[PDB]
Design a protein around this nucleic acid. Structure first.
Ligand code: MG
Ligand code: MG
Length: 337
DNA sequence: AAA
């Protein structure tokens, strides 16, 4: 296993500014780490008792100031992620999917969700928020049968925290948001709508709290998609093909459909060839977006050496040496007040 | 949970 290379994009700055790093990582929850989907990885290496060590080691060694995780299993949050990262100087916020859904005690422990951790020496938690996409869809369906049938029926969520950035690093506020969108490629419309919902709800948090945004997400969307275009260009045509020409009027409950932020992906221009890496599918579907008005990217952690993967005949993850089917993103950012 |  060779070290992943750091890529410098700009060096540190004279003007007073704070730099900090952000990790975005889908850990692959145990529930979904099955032989069926991951036949090519041996059982002992899929198993959570084994994989959780590689996943902790990954998060520890990245050592980011802000960590956004997806597929964090409820019980693992409280008994593993939080108490171990507390020992490293972090506090955290977590919310599970499916909160409103009836299920046994046992099943409730295994439901996964999104978590944001932050170094308490650098940041103070001002507010925490959960955005349940099923609920925002319900509230915004009026008319539109697609909303209710296609969107409200997906249990996805994002979380967001409002953080106070300690003055000494330079009340400076920062919002960090983390989401995990629906997966199914036949549902490009749900992915885009969940993103519009997440962004507009994030804007609302912002009002009630101009203020820098860091947006981490497993978007399940390629760089060419309607969702990436929407996030990167401040908006998208209400007739974009990703709507499956299937919405209109209800779309602009979150509003050519537009958002106010000015965002760039930390890894734009293909700095990694894929963030999800399996036998059947490899592509960039995970992202760290930041407000380009307040922040520059100083650098990113580059991809694992493609030559190393080929030499070891690794055509999909997880693998004995790679504990998730996603690779972590890690970026260093510089914030100007 | 690019079931
Ligand atoms: Mg997954
Ligand atoms: Mg995914």
């Amino acid at each position: 296993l060779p070290p992943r290379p750091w890529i410098t994009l700009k060096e540190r700055d004279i003007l007073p500014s704070a730099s900090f790093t952000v990790m975005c990582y889908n850990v692959l929850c145990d529930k979904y780490a099955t032989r069926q989907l991951y036949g090519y990885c041996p059982s002992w290496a899929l198993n959570w008792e084994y994989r959780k060590k590689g996943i902790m080691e990954e998060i520890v060694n990245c050592d980011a100031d802000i960590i956004s995780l997806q597929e964090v299993e409820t019980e693992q949050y409280f008994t593993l992620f939080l108490p171990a990262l507390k020992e490293r100087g972090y506090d955290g916020f977590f919310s599970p999917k499916s909160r409103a859904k009836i299920m046994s005690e046992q099943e409730r422990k295994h439901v996964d969700g999104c978590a944001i951790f932050f170094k308490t020496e650098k940041f103070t938690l001002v507010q925490k928020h959960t955005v349940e996409f099923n609920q925002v869809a319900m509230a915004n369906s009026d008319g539109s049968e697609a909303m209710l049938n296609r969107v409200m029926t997906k249990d996805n969520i994002g979380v967001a925290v409002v953080l106070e950035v300690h003055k000494e690093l330079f009340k400076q506020l920062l919002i960090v948001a983390n989401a995990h969108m629906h997966w199914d490629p036949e549902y490009s419309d749900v992915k885009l709508i969940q993103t519009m919902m997440f962004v507009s709800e994030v804007k609302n948090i912002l009002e009630k709290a101009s203020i820098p945004l860091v947006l981490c997400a497993d978007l399940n969307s390629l760089p060419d998609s309607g969702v990436v275009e929407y996030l990167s260009n401040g908006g998208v045509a209400d007739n974009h093909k990703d709507f499956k020409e299937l919405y209109n009027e209800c779309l602009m409950n979150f509003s050519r459909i537009t958002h106010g932020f000015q965002l760039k992906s930390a890894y734009e221009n293909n700095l990694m060839p894929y963030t999800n890496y399996t036998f059947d599918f490899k592509g960039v579907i995970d992202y760290i977006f930041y407000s380009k008005t307040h922040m520059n990217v100083l650098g990113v952690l580059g991809p694992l050496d493609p030559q190393w993967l080929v030499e070891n005949n690794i055509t999909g993850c997880p693998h004995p040496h790679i504990p998730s089917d996603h690779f972590s993103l890690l970026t260093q950012l510089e914030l100007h007040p």
